[PDB]
Every structure is written in C-alpha cells, then in structure tokens.
C-alpha cells in the first residue's frame, strides 16, 4: 500500500460520499433559520405512533439506500464476496446513518432538520421513545461539537461499514486488508488537515452500536 495510493483512496472516498450524501449540507446550514412554529410542532405530536413510525421508517429506508450506494461506490468493497457485502451493510448501514445525521443537527438551538424545517426533540413525542431520541440528540450534539467536516464524515462512515470484526464474514482477511487502508487514509488525511485532535474526541463506537442494538426493538422492516 503505497502513499499516493492512500491519497487516491482518500479522494476516492470523499467523492463517493459527496455523490451519495443525500442532502447538500449548504442546504442544511442555510435552512437552520427555517424553524417549526409551536403550532407546526403540535401537528407532529398529535400524529399517532403508527403515523410517526411509518414516516421515520420511510426516512431510514431512503437514507439506508444512499448508504448502500456509498458502499457500492467504495473501491474494494465491490471486490468482496456477496456474503460479506450483505453482512457489512446489514450490520453497519444504520450506524452510518446515525453518523450522517449529525449534519442535520444544529447545536445552537438543539434542533434537527426534519421534513423542510428544524425542530427540537419534542417533534417525535408521538413515537413514545423519549429516551432513545434523547440519546440520538446527544450523539449528534457530540459530533457537532467537533465541527465534523464532509471528508471526515466520509472517511469515518467508511470505517464504520468496513469492520472486520462483524460476525458472519468468510473472507475476513480481505476486509481487514481493506479496513486498514481506510484507517491509513483516515489518519493520513487528518494529518494533512491538522485534525488529529478529533480522534480522542470521537465517541468510542460501542455506543454507536449501543443506540441501535441496545435501544432498538425493531417491529417493522
Ligand atoms: C431525531 O430523530 C430523527 N432525526 C432525523 C433527521 C433527519 C432525517 C432525514 O431522513 C435525513 C436528513 C438528512 N440526512 C439524513 C441522513 F444523512 F442521515 F441520511 C437523513 C430527513 C428528514 N427530513 C428529510 C427531508 N430527510 C431526508 C430523518 C430523521 C429520523 Cl427518521 C429521526 C427518527 N428516527 C431516529 C432514528 C431511528 C432509530 F431507530 F435508529 F432510533 C428511529 C427514529
């Protein structure tokens, strides 16, 4: 694994994310002024849990679609066997989406972009998952404090997908080979941008899975 190869890997990863990030970001930052009025927030709270769960379920499904496209555009990922690709996506797709969401989170007023405007966590009262949604707002808040950059998100969510310790793989050493090169590109790029400091400030990652596995009680696919 040469150096210019690692620099290519970085650019190759940052372009894949730019093409599959779902929302441009400058759109997100621009609309931070577009906030839900107390009346609009009530319209969301009066919805039933089934109405809200369906809306959200449709957002995740669409989000996960962009993550698969992101994975599908990663060099090396397509070279894996089909079993590994499904194993990795089936385990990491959701975690990547949780990390991607921090971009829609505005730490100024503790609101997230949701269907055209920004709202606080009281917007999802109908789901009945007060604690779960609180935890997500904390996570997104932690990542926003770092001023996570587009390329940092692209390299990091790549390291969330390409995890050689996922159970079910059968060409493990290939995922390890790929996982290390994405760590090299991540570290290398952080050096070029004087951003080695965000490493210690990153949430572990067992918590990233903890929000899913520990707090998820899936009843719809
Ligand atoms: C705070 O809670 C949420 N906040 C969201 C923020 C943005 C988007 C959104 O889909 C989105 C916006 C920007 N970027 C992303 C991406 F990058 F993440 F893909 C997604 C979106 C919104 N409005 C539009 C037009 N869009 C596209 C969906 C969101 C959802 Cl569903 C939820 C509720 N969830 C959370 C996790 C779930 C769990 F089970 F895991 F707990 C269950 C319940």
From Swiss-Prot:
Lineage: superkingdom: Eukaryota
Q: Where is the NR LBD domain?
A: 5-221
Localisation per UniProt entry: Nucleus
Q: Where is it expressed, tissue-wise? A: Isoform 1 is widely expressed in many tissues, including liver and adipose, and highly expressed in skeletal muscle. Isoform 2 is primarily expressed in immature thymocytes.
Q: What induces or represses this gene?
A: Up-regulated in the state of obesity.
Q: What is known of its domains?
A: The AF-2 (activation function-2) motif is required for recruiting coregulators containing LXXLL motifs such as NCOA1 and NCOA2.
In the record, the note on similarity to other proteins reads: Belongs to the nuclear hormone receptor family. NR1 subfamily.
Could you give the subunit structure recorded for this chain? Interacts (via AF-2 motif) with the coactivator NCOA2 (via LXXLL motif). Interacts with the corepressor NCOR1. Interacts with CRY1. Interacts (via AF-2 motif) with the coactivators NCOA1 and PPARGC1A (via LXXLL motif). Interacts (via AF-2 motif) with PROX1. Interacts with FOXP3. Interacts with NR0B2.
Disease / disorder: Immunodeficiency 42: An autosomal recessive primary immunodeficiency characterized by increased susceptibility to concomitant candidiasis and mycobacteriosis. Candidiasis is characterized by persistent and/or recurrent infections of the skin, nails and mucous membranes caused by organisms of the genus Candida. Mycobacteriosis is characterized by infections caused by moderately virulent mycobacterial species, such as Bacillus Calmette-Guerin (BCG) vaccine, environmental non-tuberculous mycobacteria, and by the more virulent Mycobacterium tuberculosis.
Instruction: Relate the protein's function as given in its record.
Output: Nuclear receptor that binds DNA as a monomer to ROR response elements (RORE) containing a single core motif half-site 5'-AGGTCA-3' preceded by a short A-T-rich sequence. Key regulator of cellular differentiation, immunity, peripheral circadian rhythm as well as lipid, steroid, xenobiotics and glucose metabolism. Considered to have intrinsic transcriptional activity, have some natural ligands like oxysterols that act as agonists (25-hydroxycholesterol) or inverse agonists (7-oxygenated sterols), enhancing or repressing the transcriptional activity, respectively.
Name of this protein: Nuclear receptor ROR-gamma
Q: What species is given as this protein's source?
A: Homo sapiens (Human)
